[model samples]
Target: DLRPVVIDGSNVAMSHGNKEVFSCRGILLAVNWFLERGHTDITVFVPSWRKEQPRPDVPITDQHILRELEKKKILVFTPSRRCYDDRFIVKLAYESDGIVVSNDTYRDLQGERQEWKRFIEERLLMYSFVNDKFMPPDDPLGRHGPSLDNFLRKKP
Candidate 1:
């Protein structure tokens, strides 16, 4: 609870190599999953291209979900177009002593930067999507599917 959580938004949307699509529902699923367990400080990062592109395969609900997350002060940041979102994600997690939730091992960054490499190993939380259900990696932390997308919601 003391440590926050930062999400690699694009990696999550693309998935940890799951069915793999630009589906933002995955992001919401992750967010909801963390929130349920009392991770109050959660931030999601995406490349700016996600904000720029028009995705029809993705319904408006996903878009609205991010917007509402922004409204809740749960930062949904889209970094600059010229650069990848990794730096921001790692930087924030390091400074905040937070958990980095993503499937990426950061092998690419780890190959060069020893600083980030070690940090990620201790801090990363590799998550997954199984049969459209969200599954948290062990010691850390699912429900969704069929006609309904996000089951972690109110009955209304």
Candidate 2:
């Protein structure tokens, strides 16, 4: 997270469903997506298992991915021995205003989908949660999706 763009490359790559499963190829696409969007200082953090598990062709694919990222000038960091820390990553993003690219449920916005909300609620049921002022009232906007106001403003 010490960089401007910190992508949880491992989870993002692994979490993508069958259509976008984590692979050297898909991860490269994600990096390319960011690069195409004008992000030159992107950083990808790979988990240790990627190197230790030693999947067939993984090393070769890794080399190719590294070469491409280097060509685009993206920095890549793979933690050692699976000892990575999420707090450090989050802190880095917070300090740099960098987006923590992760597919974890906690990263998802609240009330986006009924199923997702139910999933979160199920987790809450397992623990005694206290209410906070930061928590908006249920259906505060009477809608579950983003408003069009921002898009309208950006159009002109």
Candidate 3:
């Protein structure tokens, strides 16, 4: 199936869980994660602070990452206004019914936004950077309550 996806650019660049910093390398790999899976409608959301401002510590130039992503026909919404990057990311994913690719589980939104609970649980996907490669999200994406399969395992 050709699926669409929205990426949390900042969150992915950081590639947390393994504690990686903001490296542009992580961004494209996550995109390709879906790309290789036959997804064409890939949209990556980025705020100006993380996208435009140059940082010495970060490995890849932020601009090129966007450039590269764009060259591949990916939508790069470099939201000019500061703050609420998560909202932009969440809204696009929600509106498009596209799954999200990021380490963030969006638990904060579950409480603050209220409406996002469904998206957070069913639409949100978690990822991590292991070794040098990006570990994209796998199918059977999203979750709900106590999994019966998992619960039975615990009971013996």
Candidate 4:
């Protein structure tokens, strides 16, 4: 069964070298991709604050994208003070039986929580971006074709 798609917003945002600062291009594209495939209940989990400085040349921010997505009834979650985004993301994914769209293997946490291993193996849909295009895990060169063009052609 195809459940709702859950996104690791920060992970996807930084996949393309942070060119657009807090760019949501990747997340938005992923949302659209799944939505096009008939998955409308998309939810993205993003950090409420940044831990690192953003490049000055970057033009867009996650805040802008979050607002836009929220208008479309796409759920967005930001960590509260003293909270962690990953915890909520994993919790939500487990609860919803959703597939996680992220490249993170979560190996770092697997030792402490064995379920991380299971989740990574079973639920994660690992992917990467190359030249602003979505690349599935099986492709070595990250050549998944012209995702940007396809995304643009999609009706908003």
Clashes of each: 0, 1, 0, 0
Clashes of 2: 1
Give the TM-score of each candidate. 0.75, 0.50, 0.74, 0.71
Best by TM-score: 1
- Tens-place lDDT digits, model 1, residues 58-144: 422255656677778775666565356787888888887777888877787787788889878766777678745777654432112
Ranking by lDDT: 1, 3, 4, 2
Q: Against the unseen true structure, what C-alpha lDDT does each candidate score?
A: 0.68, 0.45, 0.65, 0.64
Error of 3 at 96 (Å): 0.9
- Residues forming the 10-long window of minimal summed lDDT in candidate 3: 147-156
Compute the lDDT for candidate 2.
Answer: 0.45
Candidate 3 local distance difference test against the native: 0.65
User: Comparing 1 and 3 by lDDT, which wins?
Assistant: 1
- Write the residue-wise lDDT of candidate 2 on 13-101 in tens digits: 54332323345554566566556545566667665455454655443234456446545556355466523544444545555544455
**C-alpha RMSD for every candidate:** 8.8, 12.3, 6.4, 7.3
Q: Candidate 2: give the clashing pairs.
A: 13-22
- List pairs with backbone clashes in candidate 4: none
Ranking by TM-score: 1, 3, 4, 2
